[PDB]
Amino acid sequence: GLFAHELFYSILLFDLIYREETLFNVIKSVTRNGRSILLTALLALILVYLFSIVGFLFLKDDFILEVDRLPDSTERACDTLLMCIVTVMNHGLRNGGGVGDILRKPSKDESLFPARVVYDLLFFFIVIIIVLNLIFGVIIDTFADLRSE
Amino acid sequence: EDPLAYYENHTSQIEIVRQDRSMEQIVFPVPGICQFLTEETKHRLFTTTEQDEQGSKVSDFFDQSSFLHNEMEWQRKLRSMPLIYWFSRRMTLWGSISFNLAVFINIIIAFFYPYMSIRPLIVALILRSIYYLGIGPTLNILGALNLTNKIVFVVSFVGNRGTFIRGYKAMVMDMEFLYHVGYILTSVLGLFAHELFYSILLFDLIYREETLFNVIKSVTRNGRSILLTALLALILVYLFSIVGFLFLKDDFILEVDRLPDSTERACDTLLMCIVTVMNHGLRNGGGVGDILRKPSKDESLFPARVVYDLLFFFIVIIIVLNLIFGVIIDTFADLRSEKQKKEEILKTTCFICGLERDKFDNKTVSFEEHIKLEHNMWNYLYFIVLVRVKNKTDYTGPESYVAQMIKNKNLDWFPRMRAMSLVSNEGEGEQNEIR
Amino acid sequence: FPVPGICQFLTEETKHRLFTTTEQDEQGSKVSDFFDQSSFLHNEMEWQR
Ligand SMILES: Nc1ncnc2c1ncn2[C@@H]1O[C@H](COP(=O)(O)OP(=O)(O)OP(=O)(O)O)[C@@H](O)[C@H]1O
Ligand SMILES: [Zn+2]
């Protein structure tokens, strides 16, 4: 920080954790069972992979994302399986509704509308409602275990 | 080399209670067959037996004694066979190889599809194969290797576990064997039907890691409660959709991106309105109000819309969706408490008699010595095996009594809440003083 | 017994750390950890002097 660049001093802020015991305990609430959290994240990734496979096999067209290109306004994000997996894992996980929010809105006249509805409901109930809540439940359980100990 | 050492190794001691409720010590020779019991089965029996209603673990061990003897016989027979024994001894290696192959295959398909420690070394070899032969041939080779490793692993598993000893019906009953068969079928499908099927093998991670299995149990333990809560949410959504269709049909206007009007009414029919609510309102944080057309204060029904939106947000979204999470947290807490209680009982009590460790403090015989020598359960298993194998004409007094109790399906011969070292010395001293 | 002079050099922070850090063994006694740390405590007394 003194020589290389002034920004490096920001790292020293982490020393707060060392100084305060309460913050250290709060962090231990996560670090104590970090393996469980990582395994839950891997399970979420596997579920996202399966959902992306299903979408690429059947729902390739609906994966249209608007792009603000620097100086077409939409792009297909399911041409390749890897790109579809990335799009799902990013948008669906970062969106409260799920992957359905980014997907093109279907019309009741469309023959595949019930399939889209079922897919969106399954993704919301499985990937978002449970696993993301499972991580929080693990954190709460770790808190309780630490307090009891 | 040392006669005393050999005699000590092959001699066991147990404690029994006669019909007169008097403790007695029996010293017997260890049957040779008992030497064939594997350590994995011993650990499984120790860490799996569950306390009965009375709180004693004796009944489960007595029930499993026969299966333990059969497993000893099977292990001796297997040891008679060198190659099959060697294959069985390395089941974990085969499982690890299969898991790594499946993970690498899944990574390759995910990264490249559509197309057309030693682990770093395997990764380098796989990368070289991909660069040289291409994605297709490398995936085919990896799938063939995975299939071969899986058949070897299944053979080793059936050999080591000896589930066939119980019976073919028993082997079919076992869930692990069926899971392995399904894994083999999925691997075959991936090799032949389509490369995507290999993704299913990723689920094997749950089987490999115990922490992930416990996390999933956090949901599976009370899945019925979660499903009933979801059904209650569906009923509430149905009632809200009925109300909306009866009164708020117009506000249900949804924009649609038709493939090559920009808005459509989604409440013309009750079923369509129910679907629209159950999808958008549940998937939207705000609730059903977010999709509904924005009302204007000038409109006469604006207060009704405000009340409807607030009720939907406070009832359907705030509570029920939070009720599911609360159920999950409660299940987590219950599982943690159960595990803690089981661990404490296992590490602070005697398996055979249930006496607490604190009872043995400040005494000649410590709890560690008591469990190790005086009240070892493996000694009881060996004695049961000896009684079964030994000829009736050669039965001694205590052996005859134990055989009669076993035949009569009785279990009082096991000592319960009684240790000779604990109280016999003090009782003898008191009796001497009284005399 | 008489208290050795070296023992007077033990610092209070180390005493508090030992009291609040020792963990019960399998038998449930804290004696073993204190016995193990006795040598380090003596060395710390020498260093403090
Ligand atoms: N009745 C019992 N109550 C509690 N723990 C028990 C009981 N019987 C056995 N154990 C424990 O189960 C394990 C079995 O002990 P065991 O005597 O088989 O040990 P080992 O070292 O494998 O044997 P050895 O060295 O005598 O060949 C040990 O952890 C022992 O403490
Ligand atoms: Zn005992």
Side-chain angles (χ1 to χ4, degrees), chain A residues 36 39-40 43 49-50 53 56-57 81-82 97 101 104-105 107-108 124 133-134 136 138 140-141 144, chain B residues 106 110-111 113 196 199 202-203 211 215-216 218-219 255 257-259 264 268 282-283 325 329 332 336:
Chain A
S36 311
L39 292 169
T40 302
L43 169 65
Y49 174 54
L50 296 154
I53 284 162
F56 164 90
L57 266 282
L81 185 60
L82 169 56
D101 277 37
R104 157 177 89 71
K105 321 203 83 183
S107 196
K108 66 188 191 177
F124 174 73
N133 288 26
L134 273 167
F136 184 43
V138 161
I140 294 159
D141 172 32
Chain B
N106 259 325
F111 270 29
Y113 189 101
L196 301 172
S199 72
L202 292 165
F203 276 149
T211 309
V215 167
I216 288 284
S218 99
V219 177
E255 64 179 15
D257 312 340
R258 303 178 183 281
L259 273 166
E264 151 175 40
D268 324 285
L282 292 184
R283 264 211 281 111
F325 184 43
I329 294 159
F332 260 119
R336 192 174 60 66

Side-chain angles (χ1 to χ4, degrees), chain A residues 13 22 24 31 36 40 45-46 52 73 75 102 127-128 132:
Chain A
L13 292 165
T22 309
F24 182 64
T31 290
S36 311
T40 302
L45 170 134
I46 289 158
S52 297
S73 56
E75 161 186 10
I102 50 151
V127 177
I128 303 302
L132 305 187

Side-chain angles (χ1 to χ4, degrees), chain B residues 91 93-99 101-102 142-158 176-188 198 201 204 207-208:
Chain B
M91 260 185 36
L93 185 63
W94 311 137
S96 99
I97 293 157
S98 162
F99 184 50
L101 281 183
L142 295 154
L145 248 201
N146 177 243
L147 190 54
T148 292
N149 216 239
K150 182 62 183 206
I151 198 154
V152 177
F153 167 88
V154 153
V155 164
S156 324
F157 165 87
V158 297
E176 182 163 9
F177 187 62
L178 302 166
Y179 154 72
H180 295 326
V181 167
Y183 186 109
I184 284 163
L185 298 173
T186 280
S187 183
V188 153
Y198 284 117
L201 303 185
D204 154 45
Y207 168 90
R208 284 261 281 171

Side-chain angles (χ1 to χ4, degrees), chain A residues 39-94:
Chain A
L39 292 169
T40 302
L42 285 164
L43 169 65
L45 170 134
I46 289 158
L47 285 165
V48 155
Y49 174 54
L50 296 154
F51 273 101
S52 297
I53 284 162
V54 167
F56 164 90
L57 266 282
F58 303 77
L59 291 170
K60 170 152 43 30
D61 321 294
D62 287 11
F63 280 65
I64 279 169
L65 273 40
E66 321 166 330
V67 285
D68 297 357
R69 303 178 183 281
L70 273 166
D72 195 3
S73 56
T74 48
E75 161 186 10
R76 299 172 64 86
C78 207
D79 298 343
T80 65
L81 185 60
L82 169 56
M83 171 46 48
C84 214
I85 289 158
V86 164
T87 289
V88 173
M89 186 178 58
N90 176 56
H91 294 85
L93 292 184
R94 288 193 315 95

